[PDB]
Amino acid sequence: EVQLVESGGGLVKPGGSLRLSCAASGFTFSNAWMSWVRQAPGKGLEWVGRIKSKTDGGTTDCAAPVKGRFTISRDDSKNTLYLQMNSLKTEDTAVYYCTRSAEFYDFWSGYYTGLEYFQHWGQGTLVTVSSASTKGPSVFPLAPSSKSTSGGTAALGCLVKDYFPEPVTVSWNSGALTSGVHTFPAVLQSSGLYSLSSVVTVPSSSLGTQTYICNVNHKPSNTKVDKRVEPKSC
Amino acid sequence: DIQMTQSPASLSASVGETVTITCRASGNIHNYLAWYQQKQGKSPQLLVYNAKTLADGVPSRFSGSGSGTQYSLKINSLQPEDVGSYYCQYFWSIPYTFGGGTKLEIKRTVAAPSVFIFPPSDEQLKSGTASVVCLLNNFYPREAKVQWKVDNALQSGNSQESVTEQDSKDSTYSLSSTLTLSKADYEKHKVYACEVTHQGLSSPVTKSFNRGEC
Amino acid sequence: VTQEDIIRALASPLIKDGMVDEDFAEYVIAREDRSPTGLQAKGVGVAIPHTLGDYVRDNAISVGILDKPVNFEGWYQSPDPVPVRVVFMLAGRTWDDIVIVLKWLKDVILDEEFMKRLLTMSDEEIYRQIYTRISKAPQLSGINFKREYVRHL
Structure with missing residues (x-):
């Protein structure tokens, strides 16, 4: 029931501006204190800022490295939390999370207060600060053959090459085939583009009767690719 | 500002062991500490708050303890699905510092590729x-x-x-x-x-x- | 007793009334280290700890009388810090509200007889004298000040 749906993340040039949104539902948004937390690729969580509810002033606080550059606001009529970014730097590249702080009731004062630990998190939205431009992937088959077979089992996959920015999702047979699937983490090459592979192990008896398609979705470029992987017989 | 020092940065442990992750605060934080678990590709999930209180739905093999500047997260009888990262967090005042994190690896028998x-x-x-x-x-x-x-x-x-x-x-x-x-x-x-x-x-x-x- | 003990003691009644956030003392301490408020005015030392930001719900003032002086770093730079016996803790919503009180406090601490009564009167008499002086300052009057906001330390 409690849901925090974030959007607005994407690619933006250094020194530019970008605004994130967090649509909340399943709780009384106007009473909740809300926060932002970010996590650079491969790094740890870092607190960004907080906004109080209107009855508690509706004021904000932000971490020192981003104070004076970032602005937090809310629109209780839309049940939406915002993070406004200005003068963005490469070191702002991170997944940004929307969070709801815990509610504590103060007996002596009679007021509610927010405690800054987070039970409910948004799904996160990736912000990429780079001068590079958006590029969709090229998808190439990794065909099964005697060189990828061992013990009644054959390996096959798809090569997702030269895309920017993250992320890309890969499923097999429209999500039906999930067992034995390995989608590798993307690796950033020196060209500035990303590449990854996704492989799956299937019974060799099924080659020639079962069709294997890898579904590649690169939402930053709005690119969907369905590549059939044909078996090699020789 | 409060600084959190989380140790160890990486941890490798066999199934069934009791694993201990520690956080030391630069000052007395008076049990205002939370613990989080983050699996790959997922958002963090709260495990413990107030240094010792287990969050809703968290398995009982997790437990937090400590006081003053020294706190610990204990995982009893480690399970293979416990692989991931763990974080402590001070939450009483700005900047609500998260620890650097601990990456947990499961130790198992050698398996050739x-x-x-x-x-x-x-x-x-x-x-x-x-x-x-x-x-x-x-x-x-x-x-x-x-x-x-x-x-x-x-x-x-x-x-x-x-x-x-x-x-x-x-x-x-x-x-x-x-x-x-x-x-x-x-x-x-x-x-x-x-x-x-x-x-x-x-x-x-x-x-x-x-x-x-x- | 330390400056931290003073600030926590004077913040406690403001926290209980919800005048300020529960962690108000953590921000006053950080501000006092960053910009000290020790003042020397005619044989009595005064400190005015306060905060900037959004940690105050309602303007308030909390007064502490020290039996023995404790050192505060000076508002103005010098060696030999200020031995303080009267502490005026300020809870101000904005920077503009704090300056208003700093105006009034300057006239207060320059009133010799007023300050020396603070050092000798009881908690109840300190309240009545201060609350009366507040009532006569229309640019302040709304500020929260209660009997519970006076303490000997």
């Missing part, structure tokens, strides 16, 4: 490049050496590795190594091979193919 190789696709060739993929499947431990040879010449500065995260059920790794050559270079040479060194292999294993055969 299955090695597969894929020549480049004809579609990629037409574009003027050639990627050769060597796949290492379901192995443990993570440490592995993968060397590319083209007509018995070792390749340097033209390959890229990627390792999956530890499987949440069998605690094994998979690894891909991708050798990228120009189409002109790929067609000049005949034998393409990846040599794999791993603890579960008595001798290094070489998977090869001859260009054009398959």
Whole structure:
């Protein structure tokens, strides 16, 4: 029931501006204190800022490295939390999370207060600060053959090459085939583009009767690719 | 500002052990500490708050303890699905500092990799490049050496590795190594091979193919 | 007793009334280290700890009388810090509200007889004298000040 749906993340040039949104539902948004937390690729969580509810002033606080550059606001009529970014730097590249702080009731004062630990998190939205431009992937088959077979089992996959920015999702047979699937983490090459592979192990008896398609979705470029992987017989 | 020092940064542990992660605060934080778990590709989930109170739905084998500046998260009877990262957090006042994090690895029996190789696709060739993929499947431990040879010449500065995260059920790794050559270079040479060194292999294993055969 | 003990003691009644956030003392301490408020005015030392930002719900003032002087770093730079016996803790919503009180406090601490009564009167008499002086300052009067906001330390 409690849901925090974030959007607005994407690619933006250094020194530019970008605004994130967090649509909340399943709780009384106007009473909740809300926060932002970010996590650079491969790094740890870092607190960004907080906004109080209107009855508690509706004021904000932000971490020192981003104070004076970032602005937090809310629109209780839309049940939406915002993070406004200005003068963005490469070191702002991170997944940004929307969070709801815990509610504590103060007996002596009679007021509610927010405690800054987070039970409910948004799904996160990736912000990429780079001068590079958006590029969709090229998808190439990794065909099964005697060189990828061992013990009644054959390996096959798809090569997702030269895309920017993250992320890309890969499923097999429209999500039906999930067992034995390995989608590798993307690796950033020196060209500035990303590449990854996704492989799956299937019974060799099924080659020639079962069709294997890898579904590649690169939402930053709005690119969907369905590549059939044909078996090699020789 | 309060600083949180989380130790150890990395942790490897066998199934069934009791694992202890510690956080030391730069000042007395009076039990205003939370613990989080983050699995790969997922958002963090709260485990403990007020240093000792288990969050809703959290398995009882988790427990937090401590006081003053010293706190600990204990995981009793470690399970393979506990692989991931763990974070402490001070939450009483600005800047609500998260610890640096602890990455948890599961220790298991040695498992040798299955090695597969894929020549480049004809579609990629037409574009003027050639990627050769060597796949290492379901192995443990993570440490592995993968060397590319083209007509018995070792390749340097033209390959890229990627390792999956530890499987949440069998605690094994998979690894891909991708050798990228120009189409002109790929067609000049005949034998393409990846040599794999791993603890579960008595001798290094070489998977090869001859260009054009398959 | 330390400056931290003073600030926590004077913040406690403001926290209980919800005049300020529960962690108000953590921000006053950080501000006092960053910009000290020790003042020397005619043989009596005064400190005016306060905060900037959004940690105050309602303007308030909390007064502490020290039996023995404790050192505060000077508002103005010098060696030999200020031995303070009267502490005026300020809870101000904005920077503009704090300056208003600083105006009034300057006239207060320059009133010699007023300050020396603070050092000798009881908690109840300190309240009545201060609350009366507040009522006569229309630019302040709304500020929260209660009997519970006076303490000997």
